[PDB]
Nucleic acid binder design. Structure first.
Ligand code: DGT
Ligand code: MG
Ligand code: MG
Ligand code: MG
Length: 539
DNA sequence: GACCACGGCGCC
DNA sequence: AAACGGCGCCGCGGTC
């Protein structure tokens, strides 16, 4: 390319190098652009950012987040990663995408700009004639990238002092548990080491090994194994409490307070747009799609996520979403009827499981019931079900029989999906998002059947993901209009922040947008709550 | 200090 | 653990 002075013309492809992967924490080390057989290298990149009307190129959203951080409204536009990810969602990194579609991801901004240009042309060519994938690019993924950049740049408020205090209390309880464990073992050891614990439980103590680990075949110390051993020895209950507390302390209570950004005073995640096989987003650096919610201590942690003063959180979560999606994709009349009658399948399973009235079903039970309902649907075995339910094998076996007897056209959808995946090599969502599953023809049964479970899950999980993305794209400009903010997506949930005076209106509008995003054979229902913290906002 | 493969486990 | 699926992060043990 011809070396041309900086500034590039309109529509040029950007390249940029960050000092580290996280755009909210990164120093912009270099910036360049490519168009019309020229390359333009920015003499000073922060200043040079001011010249661009959009970020067009590889990882466009990341540059846009750093721009937003610096007070500049630079929206992301075309990104070859999104084209590649729609072609094949195993296209997840610029290293891989470059190698596959015509270059090399280097560490030089000029080379990255030139690469972006050339990759876009090839990938755009691969998508010509792919009308449904192009519809996904233009109507969902490209506009969603802009939404995501705003969400990342906005961040979420965290009660840092509360978490610091919680740490000190949790440390004391951890000590009580670990001391009792060591007393019961007859000696101290590293309780965080599963290899050391294995020897203690199965060798030194008498306890029967329940199962084995996948890759190296050690005697497992998983929570499921330990639950089976609850009655066998008092040390087990202590280990399980220790595990809960140390998990929560090391993953959330301790790290999150140290991640507050000094310019915003907020916590800033990354919403990774080309990271999953099904078309879900992911969240990292810190992952805010797995904040605790289930146990009393987990709930305590979730309360640290709070609204700005003068604002409220609004949390919206699709009701029974993959079951509704399944009703649409399958066309089962009974399943469709269930949702037209306004019934809740999780609550029903929960009521049946724990033998209490529907009004007695608590959140723990509902989560237990979710495991059963999705478990059975996506191919859980009777043996595992026995344990989950804590009933005889023969009864757990019969539960699966009835499930599919009740909803007869699901199995037919499963089988059509699978043969189509064998013939075509891929499966697809309602909108035509594709996942290639080659091991559907594998001759090792365990490998083939694993592949099958991956393959027929994807149209359901992926259609839910497409719906939620679409709703995000539609909703974002309405929030801007009302002075509200989109903060988090958690797969079928959004967390917004709204001024107190407009919070009720924002909740109503966001609920309607999510519910009417793309009408199906059944209604989509959305549960909405408002509160000062994330826990209270889902109450 | 980094990176890893693994087991394990938090959420959806 | 087990014929549920999709993720990312932690600590260990190990390496470089
Ligand atoms: N395969 C599988 N999928 C799950 C599991 N938990 C959640 N999901 C998927 C299916 C859910 O429909 C979707 C959203 O999770 P939610 O916790 O919001 O559950 P759902 O929307 O079904 O119920 P809700 O009415 O919101 O309580 O993510 C699980 O244990 N296994
Ligand atoms: Mg839901
Ligand atoms: Mg949810
Ligand atoms: Mg792993």
């Amino acid at each position: 390319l011809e070396e041309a002075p900086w500034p590039p013309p309109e529509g040029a492809f950007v390249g940029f190098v960050l000092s580290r992967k996280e755009p909210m924490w990164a120093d912009l080390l270099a910036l360049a652009a490519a168009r019309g057989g020229r390359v333009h290298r920015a003499p000073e990149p922060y200043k040079a950012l001011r010249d661009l009307k959009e970020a067009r190129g590889l990882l466009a959203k990341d540059l846009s987040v750093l721009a937003l951080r610096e007070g500049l409204g630079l929206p992301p536009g075309d990104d070859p990663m999104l084209l590649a990810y729609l072609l094949d969602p195993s296209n997840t990194t610029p290293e891989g995408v470059a190698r596959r579609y015509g270059g090399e991801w280097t560490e030089e901004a000029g080379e990255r700009a030139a690469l972006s240009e050339r990759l876009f042309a090839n990938l755009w060519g691969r998508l010509e004639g792919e009308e449904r994938l192009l519809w996904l690019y233009r109507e969902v993924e490209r506009p969603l990238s802009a939404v995501l950049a705003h969400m990342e740049a906005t961040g979420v408020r965290l009660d840092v002092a509360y978490l610091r205090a919680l740490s000190l209390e949790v440390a004391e309880e951890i000590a009580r548990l670990e001391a009792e464990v060591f007393r019961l073992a007859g000696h101290p050891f590293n309780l965080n080491s599963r290899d050391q614990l294995e020897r203690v439980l199965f060798d030194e103590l008498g306890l029967p090994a329940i199962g084995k680990t996948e890759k190296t075949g050690k005697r497992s110390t998983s929570a499921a194994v330990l639950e089976a051993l609850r009655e066998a020895h008092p040390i087990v209950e202590k280990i399980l409490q220790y595990r809960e507390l140390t998990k929560l302390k090391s993953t959330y209570i301790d790290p999150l307070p140290d991640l507050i950004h000094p310019r915003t005073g907020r916590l800033h995640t990354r919403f990774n747009q080309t990271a999953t096989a099904t078309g879900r987003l992911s969240s990292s650096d810190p992952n805010l799609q797995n904040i605790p919610v289930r146990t009393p201590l987990g709930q305590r942690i979730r309360r640290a996520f709070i609204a700005e003063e003068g604002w409220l959180l609004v949390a919206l979560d699709y009701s029974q979403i993959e079951l509704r999606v399944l009703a649409h994709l399958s066309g089962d009349e009974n399943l469709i009827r269930v949702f037209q009658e306004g019934r809740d399948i999780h609550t029903e399973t929960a009521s049946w499981m724990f033998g209490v009235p529907r009004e007695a079903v608590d959140p723990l039970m509902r989560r237990a019931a979710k495991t059963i309902n999705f478990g059975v649907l996506y191919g859980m075995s009777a043996h595992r079900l026995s344990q989950e339910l804590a009933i005889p094998y023969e009864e757990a076996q019969a539960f699966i029989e009835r499930y599919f007897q009740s909803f007869p056209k699901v199995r037919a959808w499963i089988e059509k999906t699978l043969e189509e995946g064998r013939r075509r090599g891929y499966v697809e969502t309602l909108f035509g998002r594709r996942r290639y599953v080659p091991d559907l023809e594998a001759r090792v049964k365990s490998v083939r059947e694993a592949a099958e479970r991956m393959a027929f899950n994807m149209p359901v999980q992926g259609t839910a993901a497409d719906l939620m993305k679409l709703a995000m794209v539609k909703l974002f400009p309405r929030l801007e209009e009302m002075g509200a903010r989109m903060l988090l997506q958690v797969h079928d949930e959004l967390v917004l922040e709204a001024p107190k005076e407009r919070a009720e209106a924002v909740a109503r509008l966001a609920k309607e947008v999510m519910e009417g995003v793309y009408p199906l054979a059944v209604p989509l229902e959305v549960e909405v709550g408002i509160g000062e913290d994330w826990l209270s906002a889902k109450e």
